[PDB]
Amino acid sequence: FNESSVNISSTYLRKVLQDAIQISSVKNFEYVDRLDSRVLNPQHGNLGWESFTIEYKIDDLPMSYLFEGHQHLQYLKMFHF
Amino acid sequence: GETITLQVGQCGNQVGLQYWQQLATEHGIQSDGSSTPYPKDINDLQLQELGKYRNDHPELFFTLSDSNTYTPRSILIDMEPSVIAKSTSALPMFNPRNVHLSNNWINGYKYGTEEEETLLNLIDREVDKCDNLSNFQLFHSVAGGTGSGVGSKMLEVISDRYGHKKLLNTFSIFPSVVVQPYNTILTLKRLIDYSDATFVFHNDSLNRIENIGANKLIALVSASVSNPLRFPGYMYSSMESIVSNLIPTPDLKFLTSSIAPFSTQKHNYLNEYDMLLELSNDRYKTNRVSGDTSYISMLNYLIGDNLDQREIRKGILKSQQRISFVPWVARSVLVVHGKKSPYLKNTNLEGIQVTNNTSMIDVFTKILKQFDLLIKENEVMEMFNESRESVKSIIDEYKACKEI
Amino acid sequence: GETITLQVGQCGNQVGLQYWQQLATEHGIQSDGSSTPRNDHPELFFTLSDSNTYTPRSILIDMEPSVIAKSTSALPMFNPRNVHLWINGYKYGTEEEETLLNLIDREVDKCDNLSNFQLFHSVAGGTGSGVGSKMLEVISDRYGHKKLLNTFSIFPSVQPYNTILTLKRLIDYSDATFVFHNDSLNRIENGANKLIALVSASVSNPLRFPGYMYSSMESIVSNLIPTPDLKFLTSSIAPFSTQKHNYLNEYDMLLELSNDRYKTNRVGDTSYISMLNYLIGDNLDQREIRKGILKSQQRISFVPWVARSVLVVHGKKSPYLKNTNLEGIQVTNNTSMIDVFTKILKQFDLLIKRKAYLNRYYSSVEEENEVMEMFNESRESVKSIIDEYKACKEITYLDDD
Amino acid sequence: NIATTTKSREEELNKRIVNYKIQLKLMKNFLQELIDR
Amino acid sequence: REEELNKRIVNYKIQLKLMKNFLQELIDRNN
Amino acid sequence: LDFIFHFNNYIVQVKKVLVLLNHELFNEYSKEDQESIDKRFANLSDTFLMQYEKFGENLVTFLATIKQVGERENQGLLELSNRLELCF
Amino acid sequence: EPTITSVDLTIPLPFPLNLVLNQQLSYQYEIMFKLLINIKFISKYNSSNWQEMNYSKIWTNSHFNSSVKKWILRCRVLHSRICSFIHELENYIVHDVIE
């Protein structure tokens, strides 16, 4: 996360997420598969700390159609703070 | 992170056995290392007509083998084998490889120095099984013989072998004989030098609480301190974060703990509001505290299902006024909303309070006075002088803490 | 390719009996040579008849018939035709050179494509050590250097003279010599032949139970012998297995295989010249092995001029062993050989300045001169190998200054 | 900017192109065998 | 940048479709 | 791979040259001058140095290429890059 | 180029097995066969050359002068480096990718 948001690649994110899953107590979590990390806006002036966001995938269920994108955006704003 | 527990001395082993049995009971791990299926969550409501999955972190303390068998991250160091035999018989899950078997403090210290390589190999073996180590936990008695010297030498060895890059707690038990004051001061010197956060337990105050054994209370307090770590919640969940909230400077590192005794009697506390007020009482603290005390930091533990937020908020507000805070520390009282283990059938609340007050002035004053009375090759006397000066170095510092 | 085992002396015969019992157990071959109900390849170590019988390729050599009789009676499937019955022993070996040469040529003719010669013998075996020392010379002379030799020599716990005389030929003719000490074997046990048999049986596991890689002895040995001078190998075995408190992961096997207490020879600070780790389990988790390899590379002190690579072979467990937990063997090439060789040389010098027992060897003036020149040559060769192993440690090894 | 994700976008596209280069060449070989008769 | 890879992907989609149509034409004419 | 294969072929052709350098075995093999011997050794010096430096160049370029590709796209190549870097 | 660069293996399949083991899958398998045979062959060339470099009479001769001895030592060390590099590459390709 120290380097700029443009430098971070997908493989490094996957390595970080997998290592953090193994270290913490989520490795026993029922839906540990659904967890997925991403970077929203890879701007040059944004560091890793200012862009990393954790995303809980519920696309596999019909429930995802009920939850409009606006709610998810408000879930990512509060997470950022 | 991971935590490694070290137990030194007969008293340390006696405490650690019950500490590990307590943890095993909370996490549903049987004495043979076999795990129990996790009961369904209580607040995870489900629709109704009218196996390895878990949501706790037991492996933070127990090493989970490939055969679904847990094993504590403990190291037992002493010389008398009877206590170790009793501990192993009570808990077969203890790894036999982790046991090391062999009055004057100097003799024990020299023995630890001579045989330091073997103990160091054992520490390194335990660390190698840990990824991203966090801290060490020490269970030893300040005075009593084997525990003092061996624990002091292990303290120095661990402090300097890893470059102090991991914090090191200490669940020291203070004594309630001509050699005891010497041992107490000599060990307290290394506690000042190396330990990062010391939980002072006084046997006399423990007996005062009990009559209303003594090792069970220590085990309960130690196993309840780390409740947020084993059942993660919104705050803390890291041993460094809990300690850092109570230690403003490296010198003011000595913590003391208060325990609510009535966890089982049918006249238990009515609600969280009552227990918040009762925890501040001075009759249930594990260290004798007078009325001139002042608190540098506050931390309250609550353990129960679906605690009422209104009661906790009102209790914090009422307790904030009662507590006499040090002038230069902002009035701050923090409550930890711990989660009760689903394996425990008891539904009553438990609550442990950990405090960093200025009552240490009187305790170390008593120790210093006894040492001065008893004093009345030459290298050892120089070490005695150094211990006297080091203890005074925090006596005067805790006194100055009163001043802006 | 096929391998031929040579057993010399009483210690060699006992170790060979344990070794062949272990190998037959692994391949399910019964004591009488009958099969038991293929993907494995015992043909590299057993001769298969067109009547479905497996017999070992080994050759038994001993001075007395009691040991050979015990070995043959314990394992009836030995072929009796292969049984044959210090300076005195070596001169005796000269007399029987023709018979032994033909005896070995029979085994070589019997196999289809020979690969290497295995030799089980004890350096401190007295007369048997002499006959084995002659065996190495005759084999190396007749078959040239196209076929390499592996010697599982057992080192000693008047003996200094015998150890030096055997070590001269061991240095000259062997191609890859394992070093075993009874001291470290009994220290590990705190009988002893069951450790040597286990190590030797596991060393060839990739050949008998083929996998993706390491299908030949050339590949296994070439990874450990950068120079023909540095030919002595140190073997390490993890003993904590089959107990309840076994190593929980192969990663902990890789980390704890490097402990100096498990090594089969007395060791202080050492520099590793080459490494190769055996892991033998039904299923092996790759990611654990990757993490363990990375940690092992970052922890171990290699000599400056070596590539600094750690190799882990993924051995396959035998179907005939029921679901046993993981076990592993480590074979290394260290600079610790200087300590043991220096100890041997110190003993030899101490006992050579004092003419204690040389009367049993010096028979006349010509015998005195012969033994003196032989001893001087052996001492000089041992010093040469010590100096080579010492020059390997420093950083100017490749410099011509 | 396009969102970054743990899965390698360029790797997926490259694998698709390689799988589209195998189908094309196999089809060409088959058509050559068909035409020359 | 990856626009270029997508462009090449679609170009090869068209080329594969053309090859398959060639096979169909040839078979229809031979029958 | 080309460099390694050609190095093996060069090693095979070296065996012939070493016969002429030493005398003790040249007489045995010839059964079927100082300046010339010095010239032969001088030639081998430059040839061997060329192979040594070519190996170094190829190794450096190969490690750099694996590192960039592993960082960009492939996770598996990244750990290989770490291992090879920890080797040399 | 040496023949090793151009030796291929093909396996026709019975109906209907060939429908699942489609020709595109078998072709991708054949490419791996060619790569692995190249690496296996080079490893077999690295072992045989290691046998001669260490134990052939000419190389093992002791009567060379100092300069030739150091030259031989340098060559042996360089070949050991190449051997270790090839074994590391083969290990990655076969265990870290295929299995």
User: Which neighbouring-strand residues pair with B197?
Assistant: B169
Could you tell me which residues come within 8 angstroms of residue F41 by beta carbon, excluding any fewer than 6 positions away? Answer: F21, G67, G68, G71
Assess whether the previous peptide bond of B72 is cis (omega < 30° from 0).
no
Main-chain phi, psi angles of C301, to 5 degrees: -90, 105
Number of CB atoms found within 10 A of residue F74's CB: 16
Residue G3 tokens, joined:
């023949």
Main-chain phi, psi angles of C111, to 5 degrees: -85, 160
* Residues C148 and G51 sit within 8 Å (Cβ to Cβ): yes
Q: How far apart are CA C105 and CA C242, in angstroms?
A: 42
Contact list in B for residue C287 (CB cut-off 8 A) is none
Q: How far apart are CA C180 and CA C155, in angstroms?
A: 6
* Residues B198 and B191 sit within 8 Å (Cβ to Cβ): yes
Neighbours of chain E (3+ CB pairs under 8 A): D
Neighbours of chain B (3+ CB pairs under 8 A): A, C
Q: How far apart are CA B356 and CA B368, in angstroms?
A: 21
Q: What ranges in chain F are assigned the alpha helix state H?
A: 2-21, 23-30, 34-72, 75-87
Going C125 to C126 to C128 to C134, the CA torsion angle's sign is positive
Q: How far apart are CA B82 and CA B34, in angstroms?
A: 26
Strands B335-338 and C2-8: unpaired
State which H helix or E strand residue A38 sits in. strand A35-39
* Residues B10 and B83 sit within 8 Å (Cβ to Cβ): yes
Estimate to the nearest angstrom the gap between the alpha carbon of B326 and the chain centroid.
24
Contact list in G for residue D23 (CB cut-off 8 A) is 24
Estimate to the nearest angstrom the gap between the alpha carbon of C40 and the chain centroid.
23
**Helices and strands (H, E) in chain G, number of each type:** 4, 0
Contact list in B for residue A30 (CB cut-off 8 A) is 53
Give the residue from B118, B198, B181, B102 showing the smallest Cα distance to B154. Answer: B118
Count the residues in chain D: 37
C245:B97 CB<8 A: yes
Q: What ranges in B234-307 are assigned the alpha helix state H?
A: 239-244, 272-279
Give the residue from C299, C361, C353, C313 showing the smallest Cα distance to C91. Answer: C361
Residue of F nearest to G90 (CA): F80
Measured CA to CA in angstroms, residue C388 lies from B156, C384, G56, G80 at distances of: 42, 6, 20, 17
**Residue B137 burial by Cβ neighbours in a 10 Å radius (0-12, 13-18, 19+):** buried
Residue C399 Ramachandran class (φ > 0 left, ψ -120 to 50 alpha, else beta):
beta
* Residues B317 and B331 sit within 8 Å (Cβ to Cβ): no
Give the residue from B111, B177, B103, B189 showing the smallest Cα distance to B368. Answer: B189
Q: Cα(first)–Cα(last) distance of chain B, in Å? A: 37
Q: What ranges in B245-359 are assigned the alpha helix state H?
A: 272-279, 309-322
Contact list in F for residue A9 (CB cut-off 8 A) is 71-72
Chains C and F touch, contact meaning at least 3 pairs of CB atoms under 8 angstroms apart: yes
Give the residue from B22, B51, B49 showing the smallest Cα distance to B36. Answer: B51
Q: What does the radius of gyration of chain A's CA atoms come to, in whole angstroms?
A: 14
CA dihedral C203, C207, C209, C212 (to 10 degrees): 110
Q: How far apart are CA C204 and CA G95, in angstroms?
A: 19
* Residues B236 and B228 sit within 8 Å (Cβ to Cβ): yes
Which of G49, G54, G62 to mutate to test binding with chain F, by most F CBs within 10 Å of its CB?
G49
Q: Cα(first)–Cα(last) distance of chain G, in Å? A: 30
Q: In what order do the strands lie in the sheet with D4-5?
A: A52-56, A35-39, D4-5
Chains D and E touch, contact meaning at least 3 pairs of CB atoms under 8 angstroms apart: yes
CA distance D14 to chain A (A): 15
F74:A14 CB<8 A: no
Residue of G nearest to C174 (CA): G55
Could you tell me which residues come within 8 angstroms of residue B277 by beta carbon, excluding any fewer than 6 positions away? Answer: B315, B318, B319, B322
Strands B70-72 and B62-64: antiparallel
Angle separating helix axes C9-27 and C127-143, nearest 10 degrees:
60
Query: Rounded to 5 degrees, what angle do the CA atoms D1, D5, D9 make?
Result: 85
Give the residue from B259, B144, B157 showing the smallest Cα distance to B199. Answer: B259
Number of alpha carbons in the 13 Å side-chain half-sphere of residue C308: 19
CA distance F71 to chain D (A): 11
**What single string gives the DSSP state of each residue in chain D?**
-PPEESS-HHHHHHHHHHHHHHHHHHHHHHHHHHHT-
Going C58 to C59 to C62 to C65, the CA torsion angle's sign is positive
Query: Rounded to 5 degrees, what angle do the CA atoms B206, B210, B211 make?
Result: 125
Strands C59-61 and B197-202: unpaired
State which H helix or E strand residue C313 sits in. strand C312-315
Q: How was this structure determined?
A: cryo-EM
Residue C105 tokens, joined:
């040529």
Task: Work out the widest C-alpha separation in chain C, in whole angstroms.
Answer: 68
B12-15: long-range contacts at Cβ-Cβ below 8 A with a sequence spacing of 24 or more?
B12/B78, B12/B139, B12/B140, B12/B141, B12/B147, B12/B151, B12/B173, B13/B76, B13/B78, B13/B83, B13/B84, B13/B87, B13/B139, B14/B83, B14/B215, B15/B139, B15/B171, B15/B173, B15/B215, B15/B218, B15/B219, B15/B222
Estimate to the nearest angstrom the gap between the alpha carbon of A80 and the chain centroid.
11
Give the residue from F60, F81, F61, F57 showing the smallest Cα distance to F70. Answer: F81
CA distance D11 to chain A (A): 10
Q: How far apart are CA C168 and CA B282, in angstroms?
A: 83
Q: Cα(first)–Cα(last) distance of chain C, in Å? A: 43
**Helices and strands (H, E) in chain A, number of each type:** 3, 2
Estimate to the nearest angstrom the gap between the alpha carbon of A15 and the chain centroid.
13
Main-chain phi, psi angles of G72, to 5 degrees: -60, -40
Main-chain phi, psi angles of C269, to 5 degrees: -65, 135
* Residues G47 and G69 sit within 8 Å (Cβ to Cβ): no
B128:C248 CB<8 A: no
Estimate to the nearest angstrom the gap between the alpha carbon of F37 and the chain centroid.
22
Measured CA to CA in angstroms, residue C132 lies from C97, C127, C129, C136, G19 at distances of: 12, 9, 5, 6, 62
Task: Write the residue in B63, B96, B97 that is nearest to C248 by C-beta.
Answer: B63
Residue-wise over B200-217: b if at least 16 C-beta within 10 A, else e? Answer: bbbbebbeebeeeebbeb
Residue B164 tokens, joined:
């102090």
Question: What single letter denotes the amino acid at residue B62?
Answer: F
User: Which neighbouring-strand residues pair with B143?
Assistant: none
**D23 CB near a chain G CB, below 8 Å?**
yes
Residue B390 tokens, joined:
């080091």
CA distance G10 to chain C (A): 20
* Residues F8 and G49 sit within 8 Å (Cβ to Cβ): yes
Give the residue from A3, A25, A22 showing the smallest Cα distance to A14. Answer: A22
**Helices and strands (H, E) in chain C, number of each type:** 14, 12
F24:G79 CB<8 A: no
